[PDB]
């Protein structure tokens, strides 16, 4: 029932918006395809499109369904279904293809570096496809580096956002350089004024990283089994003042990870103008306070595409 061989790819281009994937500048990856459907395609037939195995259409939301192809008027041409495992859309055809002949359709699908696939900086040959007909381009994946100010060093990104429960998750690397940090204090804040909400209840788990361990340059951990959960240690070390939590690390030599899930407030305009920040403080030689800080904010792609047909007489 797969009718891939019946599909005529007129165009297919992978772009990166230079061939550099700034995954931490929220750089997208276009795949702008066009094609022709022959009339020998009937209701219930299936053509495919697959993404590269190392991308994902949505970075921080599991809600990555494929769009559906729709004629100018709005009648549906096919409804797609995305399988994360195989990273492949399967587009089933509606009765449009029976009512209509000579059918030309365009797509444009954005995607992000799958942080589970590619935990560290590297080059990749990306391979995309439209109905089996592959195309490729080479790229390199740069991950952000931490801010350093004396001993104070930190970095962070957004990992998972839940449009349903209105929460957002941020993962913070306190002391990725495993420096000796004296009276270390780490703040998390809605930011720099406010966009989210941080208080007693905002979930903050803390993990210690042994000196032999190296963290994923993606800045997204997937497995916390293999890190010392120290969250209870920080029980008696939490100050909360004006959308700002403050953590008292004391003198440290070890890296740490913080997992912050925080409620956000929806924007009336109906876009996701969300942002959150952290900052690491350490006393320096001269007895001053050095602040390195990090702030993340959400970026949005959105697939687009339609079709068109002769009306059969």
């Amino acid at each position: 029932n797969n009718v891939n061989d019946l599909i005529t790819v007129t165009k297919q281009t992978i772009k990166v918006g230079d061939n550099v994937a700034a995954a931490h500048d929220g750089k997208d990856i276009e795949y702008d395809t066009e094609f022709t459907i022959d009339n020998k395609v009937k209701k219930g037939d299936t053509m495919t499109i697959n993404y590269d195995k190392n991308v994902i259409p949505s970075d921080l939301t599991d809600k990555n369904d494929p769009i559906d192809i729709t004629d100018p008027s709005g009648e549906v041409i096919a409804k797609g279904t995305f399988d994360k495992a195989t990273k492949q859309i399967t587009y089933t055809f509606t009765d449009y293809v029976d009512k209509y002949e000579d059918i030309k359709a365009r797509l444009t699908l954005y995607s992000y570096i799958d942080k589970q696939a590619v935990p560290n900086e590297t080059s990749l040959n990306l391979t995309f496809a439209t109905a089996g007909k592959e195309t490729s381009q080479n790229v390199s994946v740069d991950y952000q580096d931490p801010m350093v100010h004396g001993d104070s060093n930190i970095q962070s990104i957004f990992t998972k956002l839940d449009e349903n429960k209105q929460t957002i998750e941020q993962q913070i690397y306190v002391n990725p350089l495993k420096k000796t940090a004296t009276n270390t204090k780490v703040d998390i804040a809605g930011s720099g004024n406010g966009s989210t909400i941080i208080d007693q209840n905002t979930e903050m788990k803390v993990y210690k990283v042994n000196p032999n361990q190296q963290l994923p340059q993606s800045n997204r951990i997937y497995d916390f089994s293999q890190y010392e959960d120290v969250t209870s240690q920080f029980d008696n070390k939490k100050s909360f003042s004006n959308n700002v939590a403050t953590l008292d690390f004391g003198d440290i030599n070890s890296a740490y990870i913080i997992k912050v899930v925080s409620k956000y407030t929806p924007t009336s305009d109906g876009e996701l103008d969300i942002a959150q920040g952290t900052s690491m403080r350490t006393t320096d030689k001269y007895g001053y306070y050095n602040y390195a800080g990090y702030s993340n904010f959400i970026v949005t792609s959105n697939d687009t595409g339609g079709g068109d047909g002769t009306v059969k007489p």
Binding site: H24, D25, G26, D28, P57, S58, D59, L60, T61, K63, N64, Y110, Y112, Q144, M147, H149, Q155, S156, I157, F158, L161, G192, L272, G277, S279, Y288, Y289, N290, Y291, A292, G293, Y294, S295, N296, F297, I298, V299, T300, S301, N302, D303
Partner: peptide, 17 residues
């Protein structure tokens, strides 16, 4: 259809006197 960005800000804080 959704991903993050990162930004950096540094200051120092001493005592005026």
């Amino acid at each position: 259809r959704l991903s993050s960005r990162s930004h950096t800000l540094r200051t120092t804080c001493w005592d005026g006197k």
